[PDB]
């Protein structure tokens, strides 16, 4: 999908392979796979198709970006990774955060998302306001994923399935609790819970519920609730696409 992968040195590639292993162990032990996937989404997602500036280029590490109200918790995620990152000084932060997202999906039992190295760390972040609003609906999803990032309606629904792991926190976003009964297991339960209604102890954001009422998003929700393999396929496709917005002269 219009992507040309940069050449990196044999030493860079070796660090990638070694960092991936250390990330597995670290992330599994710390139980922070959801936060790492969220960090990856944010580090990819401050991308714009209308300006082509900022986003998946080591920019999330800057304290100017960790300030935002959609960024509560992203500071924690960056901090958790600092010591590991210091073991692999050759790797760009951009690649490191995307590798962490790929690993987060993998060690929670999700699909193996292909990873290619070579994202450069850019010197200035994008503007605050591009990123997601849980209180909004389908027009908003299409604005953040479609218009800004060039992703398709299928990507939108698949990627929303990221919420199958993790939870909201009253002190971060203000929302609270896991979307699923197994929030460290990457499966299609996000979609099953979304369809089944609101359960005691389980979260649905207005942005999740937007998927149910949209003529295009809904049949996809039905498909993924019915077929985890179809979910895994489309999820891996969309995660790779998202992770690579930071590549290839866009």
Catalytic residue among 42, 62, 68, 116: 42
Binding mask 205-224 for ligand HEM (x = CB under 6 A): x-x-----------------
In sequence order, the β-bridge partners of residue 177 are 168
230/154 Cα distance (integer angstroms) = 11
Count other C-beta atoms under 10 Å from residue 134's C-beta.
17
Which residues touch 48 (CB under 8 Å, ≥6 apart)?
54, 55, 126, 130, 148, 149
Is 42 a catalytic site residue? yes
49/250 Cα distance (integer angstroms) = 9
102/240 Cα distance (integer angstroms) = 9
Give 116 or 140: the residue with its C-beta nearer to ligand [C-]#N: 140
User: How far is Cα of residue 132 from the mean position of the Cα atoms in its chain?
Assistant: 12
Number of chain residues interacting with ligand HEM (CB under 6 A)? 24
Minimum Å gap between C-beta 240 and ligand HEM is 12
167 is in an annotated binding site: yes
Near ligand HEM in 146-165, by CB under 6 A: 159-160, 162-163, 165
Binding mask 4-43 for ligand [C-]#N (x = CB under 6 A): ----------------------------------x--x--
What amino acid positions are annotated as catalytic residues?
42
Residues at the annotated binding site?
A: 30, 35, 41-42, 163, 167, 169, 172-173
């Amino acid at each position: 999908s219009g992507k040309s992968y940069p050449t990196v040195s044999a030493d860079y590639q070796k660090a990638v392979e070694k960092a991936k292993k250390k990330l597995r162990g670290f992330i599994a032990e710390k139980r922070c796979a959801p936060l790492m996937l969220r960090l990856a989404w944010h580090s990819a997602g401050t991308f714009d198709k209308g300006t082509k500036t900022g986003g998946p280029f080591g920019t999330i590490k800057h304290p100017a970006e960790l300030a935002h109200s959609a960024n509560n918790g992203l500071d924690i995620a960056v901090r958790l990774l600092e010591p590991l990152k210091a073991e692999f000084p050759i790797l760009s932060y951009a690649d490191f955060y995307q590798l962490a997202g790929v690993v987060a999906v993998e060690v929670t039992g999700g699909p193996e998302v292909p990873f290619h190295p070579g994202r450069e760390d850019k010197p200035e972040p994008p503007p605050e306001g591009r990123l997601p609003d849980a209180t909004k609906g389908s027009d908003h999803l299409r604005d953040v994923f479609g218009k800004a990032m060039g992703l398709t309606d299928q990507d939108i629904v698949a990627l929303s399935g990221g919420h199958t792991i993790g939870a909201a926190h009253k002190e971060r976003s203000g929302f609270e609790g896991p979307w699923t009964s197994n929030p460290l297991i990457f499966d299609n339960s996000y979609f099953t819970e979304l369809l089944s209604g609101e359960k005691e102890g389980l979260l649905q954001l207005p942005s999740d519920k937007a998927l149910l009422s949209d003529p295009v998003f809904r049949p996809l929700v039905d498909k993924y609730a019915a077929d985890e393999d179809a979910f895994f396929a489309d999820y891996a496709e969309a995660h790779q696409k998202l992770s690579e917005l930071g590549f290839a002269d866009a």
